[PDB]
Amino acid sequence: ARVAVLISGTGSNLQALIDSTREPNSSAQIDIVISNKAAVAGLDKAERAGIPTRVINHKLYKNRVEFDSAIDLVLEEFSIDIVCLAGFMRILSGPFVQKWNGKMLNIHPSLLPSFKGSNAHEQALETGVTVTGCTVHFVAEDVDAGQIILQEAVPVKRGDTVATLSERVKLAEHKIFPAALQLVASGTVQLGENGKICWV
Structure with a gap:
């Protein structure tokens, strides 16, 4: 599968995906890395790996639909099969999410459904849990x-x-x-028509 990774910062997740897609018997290759912000370390990591990058600055768009369309244009330019959100900080609009349904993954730093939102650790600390974690999920409209x-x-x-x-x-x-990327890229894990995860 051809994979895009969207980012907005450091890219430590990007890096683990790069290393992994280049291990033997990988079902995925990272072909484009897109940031909504300039000058983030994730862009350097992509470039040092020999992977093309684009900065698509979200502040230059009237609304989310148009920002998403500029992203989608690049995804088509690169014939992308799967999109990974790796520290990407922009909520995507309905149509983009609908278009990529079952082909877009996100990494979230809590055990969902606890601590939705971008400050999960801050919620985890306030709440006094002794166990937290992380989740890879298919991206749906609801954050x-x-x-x-x-x-x-x-x-x-x-x-x-x-x-x-x-x-x-x-x-x-x-x-x-x-x-999780390998599972989806190999077709081992799919989003079923009924909107439910299925393992093959």
């Missing part, structure tokens, strides 16, 4: 609410900050996101 592919539990340590907990969960992310 952080599409069908779950893989999850991994990560302990919370007494005295954790957002940063220490974030780092520990990232190590799990870098395991399940590549594994």
Whole structure:
């Protein structure tokens, strides 16, 4: 499968996907990396891996539909099969999400359905859970609410900050996101017509 990765920052998840798609017997290849922000380290990681990149600045669009269309134009230019959201921070519109249904994955740093939103660790700390984790899910219109592919539990340590907990969960992310990408790219895991996950 040909894969696009969208990002908005550091790209540590991008990096794990790059390394993984280049291991032997990979069903996926990363062909384009798109950022909505300039000058993020994820763009450097893509370029250093020999992967083309684009910056599509979301602030230059009247609305989300038009920003998404510019993304979609690049995805077509690159004949993309699967899109991975790896620290991508823009909520995508209905039509884009509908178009990519069953072909778009996201990594979220909690055990969904707990702690939806971009500040999951901050929610996890406030709430006092001792176990948090991460989730790879298909992207649906409802934020952080599409069908779950893989999850991994990560302990919370007494005295954790957002940063220490974030780092520990990232190590799990870098395991399940590549594994989930392989599952989808191989057709082992599909979104079924009834809107439910199915394993082949």
